[PDB]
């Protein structure tokens, strides 16, 4: 069901949750002064979500959330990324540099406090009401003198909600000794990762396992061998019961951003500028990279990760534009603004209509600048690798202006480091030239001569419109066009040559235009934010908050729904549950994405599923639910009707990515690893019994 709800809204939503099958008492899910399931949810390393699953501080999150830590501990001798990792005693769990988990110890509505303090600010158009520095000064004032000394590991933050109409203060408890305990092999953790990104059905065992360490009283402490596992106030019980179609499911976690209050004009702008440009420019870039990767196996090795990275937000933009085209997103926002405008007229209060018209007018005024910004960002800053070639600093240019040879040597050395990082082992000058010719052809079609970065005016003025000749000239003459050209430069460095370098002048020119567009566009954000404060206040006055969730803002939310598949297209149905049979159907030993771990294959051959399969002998892998998630919900716990852990959220289907603007009941799903499959992998693949024995596994 729709919405990413504040914990304060649990009372408002409880009747709807019970209608969908919730059996918990409200207090046990969230309460403000006691212990609740909210106390087992953590913010994992500043983006992801995770959950406490034992009375000794065991934490589950996704494999993709734990990846950087698994990779940091991996070597040729112990390649944990490929083999997995299973600590067979607590003393073998691996500490992690610069890691955190954050508990939300307390939440408080401070709206009246912040609105009182904002009365002091004289300028009615001040943006201090949304300023992180200003709200942190209010938090510090409220928490009082020596809050930190009186509360080990605790800190406070105030955040704005509903466009500045509501403020909450969070008291956060931060642990920095968080050790790696367990991870499946990447073949399981990343099964289908690029090909199946944003796809349901999905077959990925996307989990990893950490443990929170602390002092002997459970307070946060920096890494020490004297630290002991946290004895937490709440952990999740793990259900062996499984899921069935239509079962209630709920999620808690930290969704980052939504746009539920876009005007119709903002939907049109998101389609016609942001998404259309991203789709067109990435289709060009990807099409050239694919052609070069198919033709040369070494180019495939070098460019595979850059290609999949481009494809990530490409696929999301295609899904978002699909929803705008087919699912009525614009008309939904048109109806929302039309309803409030009709009500405002009945109330004798034109300020809501004025707010919608101010947003419309700002969107219309910025259209050509925003188009230019997205064209340069997708077409060149992201699109063309040599845009990020080195630019000598003034110090470096002075340094080899001079006759001090040793400062000169030091300037060349600094430049060499940036060149080596640019033209690294994954960089092909030939691929970059082909990509640049295709991307600049599009860019020069769309951006008129008078609005070009100055260096690009040389295509018309010096090369007679021949983009291939222009790009050929950059690489031919630049000291960064090849390793031999850089080495020749480093040997007899000419200050005149460097100031005239066509790659340096190209890079400088396109970053200059990008910067000047950014600076001219930024001011247009503020009138829309101020109008949204009014627009959202009207919507809330008119219809209340029960069916109007506040946009995500990196804070703790709950969502509820049911375990349920969907029909993507005519005569096609995707059910609610994938199985291990589906992993084996997808097995391809010559595609890294679809390798089946040999212990997992033997488990499947033997039907060695313990108590983790269904009664018919089918071993679950993933399920999907009608919960409302977005980026920031990776790793989130999935609870059944009784609050027991049934899975871990790890993705969303592409049909649902428009759901940041408008939830789609018949299309949007959260993609979740079944906890039964996590237990099977710990047991039969890791052989790590002590982790099963420390959990509370309930029927
Ligand atoms: K994804
Ligand atoms: K988002």
Author numbering: 22 to 720
Article sentences:
PgDPP11 exhibits a strict substrate specificity for acidic residues (Asp/Glu) at the P1 position (NH2-P2-P1-P1’-P2’-…, where the P1-P1’ bond is the scissile bond), whereas PgDPP7 exhibits a broad substrate specificity for both aliphatic and aromatic residues at the P1 position.
The crystal structure of PgDPP11 in complex with citrate and potassium ions was determined at a 1.50 Å resolution by analyzing a space-grown crystal. In addition, a potassium ion was identified in the P2 residue-binding site of PgDPP11 and found to mimic the binding mode of the positively charged N-terminus of the P2 position of the substrate peptide. The other potassium ion was found at the bottom of the S1 subsite and appeared to be trapped by an electrostatic interaction with the side chain of Asp681. Comparison the binding mode of the citrate ion described above and a dipeptide docking model of PgDPP1127 indicates that the potassium ion, the carboxy group of citrate and the water molecule (HOH240) mimic the binding sites of the N-terminus, the acidic P1 side chain and the carbonyl group of the P1 residue of the bound peptide, respectively.
